[PDB]
Each structure stands twice: as C-alpha cells, then as structure tokens.
Design a protein around this ligand. Sequence first.
Ligand SMILES: */C=C/C1=C(C)C(=O)N/C1=C\C1=NC(=C\c2[nH]c(/C=C3\NC(=O)C(C=C)=C3C)c(C)c2CCC(=O)O)/C(CCC(=O)O)=C1C
Length: 296
Amino acid sequence: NCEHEEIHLAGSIQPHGALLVVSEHDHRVIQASANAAEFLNLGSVLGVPLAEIDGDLLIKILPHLDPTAEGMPVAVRCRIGNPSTEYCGLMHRPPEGGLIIELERAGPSIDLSGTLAPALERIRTAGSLRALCDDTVLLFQQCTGYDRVMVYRFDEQGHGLVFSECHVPGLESYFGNRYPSSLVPQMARQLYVRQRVRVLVDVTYQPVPLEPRLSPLTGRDLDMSGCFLRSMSPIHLQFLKDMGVRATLAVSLVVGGKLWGLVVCHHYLPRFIRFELRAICKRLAERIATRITALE
Ligand SMILES: */C=C/C1=C(C)C(=O)N/C1=C\C1=NC(=C\c2[nH]c(/C=C3\NC(=O)C(C=C)=C3C)c(C)c2CCC(=O)O)/C(CCC(=O)O)=C1C
C-alpha cells in the first residue's frame, strides 16, 4: 500500500454538516469548519462561547465533561441559529484537541416499520455464508435505498472480493469482482474497526477546511477519526469517480477485532442517511458479524 496517508488528519469536512470543537476548560469554540456560521445561521462561531451558540446545548454538554462519566459518543437534539433550525449534534471527545460536535440538519427519516421485518426474517433463516451475505445486501438495499449494495469480503490473501451484490435493474454487476488488498489499506481497515459507518454524500464535493487547521490546544492536526463528516482520501474519491459512482455508504463487518469485510453501497446521485439509520446500519452489521463468526 498505500499505508502512509494519515486519513484521520484530513483537516476538512464534507459540506453537508458543520463541525465545532469546544474547549473543555473555557467552553469556547476553538476550531470549526469554515462553513459553520453560514450552516448554523450564526454571525460567527470561532472564539464564541458555547453559551452564545446555544445555551441549551451548553447545558446538555456540561455533564459529558465529567471524566468519570463522559457518556460519549452521544447524539443530542438541539436548536441553533437565528432563524432557529433543529439539528442532531453528534458529540465525541478525541484524546486531545477538545470536544467535537458535528451537526446535521434534522430532516425527513426513512420509515422502516413495514419493511425491516421481512428482510430481517430472511437473514434469520440463512443457513450458509452465501445465504447470509445475499440476504445482507437485500436487507441493506431495502433499508437504505442505494442503487447498488455489496458485501465486500477480504479473502485469505486479503484481496477484496465482491461476494454478494444486488442492484437496481439495468446497472452494472460488480458481483465476483476481485481486487488487490491495497485498495483498502490496513490503516483504513484499522480505522473502520472503530469507526464503523462512513457516508460519502457526493464524491465530487469541495472539502470545507477547518479553521484554524491546527488545533490551538496541540499545535497539531485535529484527530478526525471519530468524525462522521470527515473528508475522505482523494485517491479513494478518484477511484469512485473513475467508476462513475456519485455517493456511498459503507458499514464495517468486524469479526475478532478485525475487518472481515464491508457492506458497501453505491448511488449514482448524491445521497445522505441521517443519524438514526446510520446507527441502525451499524447494529445490523454487528448482528450479521456474530452470525458470520459462528459460520466459521
Ligand atoms: C494504493 C491505495 C489505494 C488504491 C490504489 C485505491 O484505489 N484506493 C486506495 C486507498 C484507499 N482506499 C480507501 C477506502 C476504500 N476503498 C475501497 C475500495 C472499493 N470500494 C468499492 O466500492 C469497490 C469496488 C466495487 C472497491 C475496490 C473501499 C470499500 C473503501 C472504504 C470506503 C468507505 O468506507 O466508505 C481509503 C480510505 C478512505 C477514507 O476513509 O478516507 C484509502 C486511503
């Protein structure tokens, strides 16, 4: 590989959310995505006390600063800006640099109450790895609506194999395509064991830089490992562009503390899935990984 890119030190986000970094000590915004004021209908954010950004959010965050009960990551409802809009704030604390708050607009959900159950039933009947993975791609396509859904399985040589696939009729089948191990570098695999869902809304996005780049607390790039808005590796973006894919969802399948494979979804238009469905996807994949585990 390909093992040298520090993909967690991206210094920028995708433009469909905003990112704030709050000091644990004075609770001011010490770093933010450059779009944050515009996205949040605020005049400014950098250097502003959280009390001014939104007092209720500050009140929400304060208990999470107890080192004996940090209770993160957490997803909180908040209302910010003037005019005021509802957001989901996904908050976590990297080892250094402060408290990160990533904000997505509240919006329409996908409703799963009539369709999740038959898809899960099918998974439960699966008696082989083949059946389980075929049922996985159907379940994730039903739940998420992506144009193509795959189980990308690492073989005994670490090559990537498109082991199961479904797609909307007329699209290309990648079923059975096999790829070099380096297309998913070990460093990326390692991150994906911890950060189990990635959503790339539009491959062609213009990254939104952090301001400042370097954390004022460390003098170093911010650790964005846990950021769902993180900008992705340009080499990977180029890969997807060369295939004509516009958006992706990827969910880790973790077995034995290692990346067994991925549920990989492609869309030919921009696509976002909101917090709750990302959480559901993560859990569904953990349940499937328990089954794989058992199947050998
Ligand atoms: C030598 C390094 C690389 C080459 C060559 C390359 O093509 N990519 C290389 C590095 C990275 N890949 C990263 C992530 C990644 N790559 C894949 C590969 C595929 N996706 C597909 O849909 C298919 C085929 C159908 C292939 C072969 C996947 C699945 C992923 C993970 C994607 C995700 O989680 O969304 C990567 C890190 C990206 C990042 O997270 O920033 C690098 C550096």
